[PDB]
Each structure stands twice: as C-alpha cells, then as structure tokens.
Ligand binder design. Structure first.
Ligand code: CA
Length: 557
C-alpha cells in the first residue's frame, strides 16, 4: 500500500552543539566539531539529527534568545560552516532538523530595538506593550525564568511581555506583518535544504485578548493557561498554508504546557498544522508543579502515561518519543538506576524501550553511552538561567533555603543534560583542548565513546544493534501498540504489530529477578535481542524468567 513518510520510520539524534564537540579550544562546541563527528553518528545508525538553536544570540538562554534569524551563532562558526555541515550530512544520506524559536526573540534583535523606541514605531506591535495597572504590572502573569512576565521600559513607560527571560520578549503573532516576516525567515532556511523544523514552545504563540489576571486556580499551573490563546490553531494553520505546504520538511512541535487532550489539534494530519508532537507528560511525569521538585512514581505511572500519549496520536496524528533531551535530567539517572552496578544494565533496558515505542525516537547525545546526571556541589556549578529564576522565586522570597534548592534542583536541572559529551579519556573527555564551558562529569574515565565503541558488550553497541533491528522490522516503528497490563509496576510488556507480524517487548524495571507470563494463546517464536539475559527463551515459551533490569524483543506467534 501507500508507504509511511521517511520521518515515521526514522531514528533521530539530538545534538546540543554547545556541548557536543569543540574544535578550537574555547570550551564551546561548534559546527566543525559536529561535522567531524558525522561518521560516528552514521556508524551508530542515525538517520537524522535535530540541532538546538544555531543562530546569532547573546546566549542568555543558550541559543533560545535570537538576535538575528539569518546569521549563525558566532560561537558555532560561520554560514560557510553551516553550509558545509549540510553538505556533509547529505553525502551520508542524513537529514537535518533545526530548532525554530519564534514565540520570542532576543531583546537585542533589531525588531525589539526599534519596537521599544516609541509607541508609534512601525515595529511597536511586533511585541506586547501594555500599561501597568494599580501601580504594578499589567496583570499577575509570572515568568518561567523568575519574577513577573512583565518588564517596564522607561523609554515609553509601558511594560513588555516575556514568558521566558527578561531578554526574551514575546513576539506578537496578532500582527500580520510580523507573521509575514517569520514566514519569510522560515523560507530562508528551508530554501537552504533543511529537512525538518522543531517549533520551540509552539503552544504559547497566541496571547489572551485583554490580558486579564489569571485566576488563583490558573496560577497554580500558569503554563497551561499560556497555551490557551484563542487564535493558536489559526496561526499554525496559516503558517502551514504559507510555508510548509510548499516544502517537504517535517515539522514537530514542542507542545509545552498544553493538556494532552488538545495535542491532536496540533498533529492530526488532516488539520494541516504540524506533523509530530513533542509532549511533556512522560518526561515530567514525576515533576512537581514548581518544576524543581520530584514526586515518587512507579512503572505503572510511566506506562499509563505512555498509553494516554499513544492514544492521542489516534489514526492521523504522530508522536516523537524520547526519554531525554536538553531540558531534563539524564535518562538513565531519571528513569533507570545510575548506580555503578546497574547503570549499564538499566541504560540498555531504557534503550530497548526507546527504540520500540510507537512514534519517532529521538536519542539525546550521550545517552547511547549511558551518561548520567552531574554531581553538582554548589549553586554556582549551574549555568542555567532557569536555576537563577528558582533562586529568585524561592530563595530570595524565603520559601526555601539555598541548600534545599541545590538538593532538589540537582536531580531535575537542565544542566544535567548539558555537560560535555564524553568522547574518550583524554583531558576533559576529548571534548575540548581548553576549559569546557560547563564541567565535564568525572565519570568520563569509565563512560566514554572510545571505550564504548571498542566493546561489543557496551551500552553503545546495544543501541547500535537495537537501531539495526528496528530498521529491519517495520512493526517496531509504525505498528500498533498494546500494553499487556497497564497496572503492572514491575515488568513493562507490550506488543507492536503490523501486517500480521507481532513483536513482544518485555522489560524488567526492578533490580531483582521477576517472572512474566505471556498473554493466553501467545508464545515466543524467536528472540531478536536481550540485555542482561543469560539465555534466550525456548521457542514456544508461554512465559519468561527475567534477570534484574533484563530487556528483550521477541517475535511471537
Ligand atoms: Ca569552539
């Protein structure tokens, strides 16, 4: 029949350029570093890479505050280096997905420098400027990065809106001329051959008319209210009509803060908005509302959340799947057990899950090596502007002590994912010849690409084999998904099926032996791969005995 888009069967790798590979000793990764490592990614089996922002930026949010959408970030290289990265990817049959940050720009962008000059400036309405009320801000909106989402500018006496940092003013999508500027910007990169675009905080583009105060209830989860602008889908549909309908690039949205029942509006292919969804339900399934505390959860919660997310894709939508990214703690530390004796086994188990979920998997740089959270010792060990925001909102206000913030944010911080990639065991793990912008994890002596690649029993080798198996088994990418028992908090088991072929995935999430009884009528036919198992089951088995953290993929009958 008709086939599926290349993107539904692709395995993506996310590169955070700043921490991938430095080639000039300034301690910051760059395009030349990434280009020199394309053979490494191709050898691992990667089809496409998504890079974080690579545009001109003051870096108050490491690329997410853009001052010029048509120039490359100085730290990464030049437009020539970007062009070379593209060409080398193409020589290897690989595709590039870039990050698109158009909910807001840097306050250094020329549009903002113009906007702030006067109320009658032609660019005034490229942003949101409003009078304060009752001697304070326009309304009670809080910022994700600390304090109020409203900043007064004495040049005009009004306040501008910023959901994120003070140096990331929100762009005004209710203004036609600004929407047209953004479309022309997207075409600039698409005309260069870019194959995909990831839309940063795509659900917050539409603002609420009149900016009334959030109710006390809404305030509890302000992220959600910010995703309820009345014109959101109208704007996304217009972006598709004027830009994406004219190219063959895949689009994916970072649907931050929106309730899961609204995700189909963004990804149902019939609506002509986005192709794939990046949801937060699973990766933040154990995160408190303040985003810096954790809440104990079990595998039952994990799988039940995945069931809900899969159901939302319905028949016309499509999900991405990921256990890690640049805004969350390290996969093995977060969902696995990173203790020395369990790190490799649990990282392999999580690899099995990642590569057998229904959706397009994104492997975050370093997770294929089993990289872990970083041992922060003081609040100064964090670079992340979000941690400074928590200090402002919780420590300076007396709600928590600096020690309490350190203790808790150490387990949830985005910086856990941003320590430099561990290439080998030379100075700073071969990431740089200079001083890394963020400290390298001392565990690079045990966790590094050179050692991983030379060992058939490594986490890396396991990911590589899982990727080969997935590429050879259509059911593992586009097949249906059925969780055999959503209530089981010990062993995660599900089937993937397509065209009469069914595969069974069984993953022990406990560090103790466990048993698993197959569904009535189901029996093992073959064993494709297992991790931490002393032996594959016998053909015909109606049950399995699992070692701690063991994972396996089996073709059933
Ligand atoms: Ca560099």
């Amino acid at each position: 029949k008709p086939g599926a888009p290349w993107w539904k069967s692709a395995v993506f790798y996310q590169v955070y350029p700043r921490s991938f590979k430095d080639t000039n000793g300034d301690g910051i990764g760059d395009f030349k570093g990434l280009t020199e490592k394309l053979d490494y990614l191709k050898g691992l089996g990667i089809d496409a890479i998504w890079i974080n922002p690579h545009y001109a930026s003051p870096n108050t949010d490491n690329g997410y505050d853009i001052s010029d959408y048509r120039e490359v970030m100085k730290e990464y290289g030049t437009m020539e280096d970007f062009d070379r990265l593209m060409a080398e990817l193409k020589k290897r049959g690989m595709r590039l997905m870039v990050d698109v940050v158009i909910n807001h720009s840097s306050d250094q962008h020329e549009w903002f420098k113009s906007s702030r000059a006067s109320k009658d400036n032609p660019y005034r309405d490229y942003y949101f400027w409003r009078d304060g009320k009752d001697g304070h801000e326009p309304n009670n909106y809080p910022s994700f990065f600390g304090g109020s989402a409203w900043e007064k500018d004495p040049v005009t006496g009004q306040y501008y809106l910023h959901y994120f940092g003070r140096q990331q003013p929100d762009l005004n999508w209710d203004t036609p001329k600004l929407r047209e500027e953004l479309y022309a910007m997207l075409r600039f990169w698409l005309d260069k051959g870019v194959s995909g675009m990831r839309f940063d905080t795509v659900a917050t583009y539409s603002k609420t008319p009149g900016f009334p105060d959030l109710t006390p209830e809404q305030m509890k989860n302000f992220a959600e209210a910010y995703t309820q602008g009345p014109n959101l889908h109208r704007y996304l549909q217009e972006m598709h009509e004027k830009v994406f309908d004219h190219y063959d690039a895949v689009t994916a949205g970072e649907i931050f803060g929106a309730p899961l029942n609204q995700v189909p509006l963004f990804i149902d292919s019939r609506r002509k908005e986005l192709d794939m969804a990046f949801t937060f339900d699973l990766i933040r399934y154990d995160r408190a509302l303040d985003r810096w505390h954790t809440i104990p959860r079990t595998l039952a919660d994990f799988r039940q959340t995945i069931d809900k997310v899969d159901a939302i894709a319905g028949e016309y939508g499509w999900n991405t799947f990921f256990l890690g990214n640049h805004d969350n703690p390290r996969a093995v530390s977060h969902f696995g057990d990173d203790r020395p004796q369990w790190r490799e086994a649990s990282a392999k188990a999580l690899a099995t899950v990642t590569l057998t979920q229904r959706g397009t998997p994104f492997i975050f740089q370093g997770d294929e090596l089993g990289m872990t959270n970083y041992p922060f010792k003081t609040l100064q060990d964090f670079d992340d502007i979000e941690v400074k925001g928590f200090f402002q909102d919780y420590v300076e206000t007396g709600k928590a002590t600096a020690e309490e913030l350190l203790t808790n944010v150490a387990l949830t911080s985005r910086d856990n994912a941003r320590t430099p990639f561990q290439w080998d065991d030379s100075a700073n793990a071969g990431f740089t010849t200079g001083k890394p912008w963020l400290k390298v994890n001392p565990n690079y002596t045990e966790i590094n690409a050179a050692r991983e690649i030379g060992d058939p029993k490594s986490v890396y080798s396991f990911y590589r084999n899982l990727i080969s198996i997935r590429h050879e088994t259509p059911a593992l990418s586009t097949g249906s998904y059925r969780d055999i028992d959503p209530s089981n908090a010990d062993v995660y088991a599900y089937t993937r099926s397509q065209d009469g072929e069914t595969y069974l995935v069984v993953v022990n999430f406990k560090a103790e032996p466990r048993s698993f009884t197959l569904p009535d009528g189901m029996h093992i036919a073959e064993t494709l791969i297992e991790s931490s198992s002393p032996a594959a089951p016998a053909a015909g088995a109606a049950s399995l005995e699992l070692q701690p953290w063991q994972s396996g993929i089996y073709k059933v009958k």
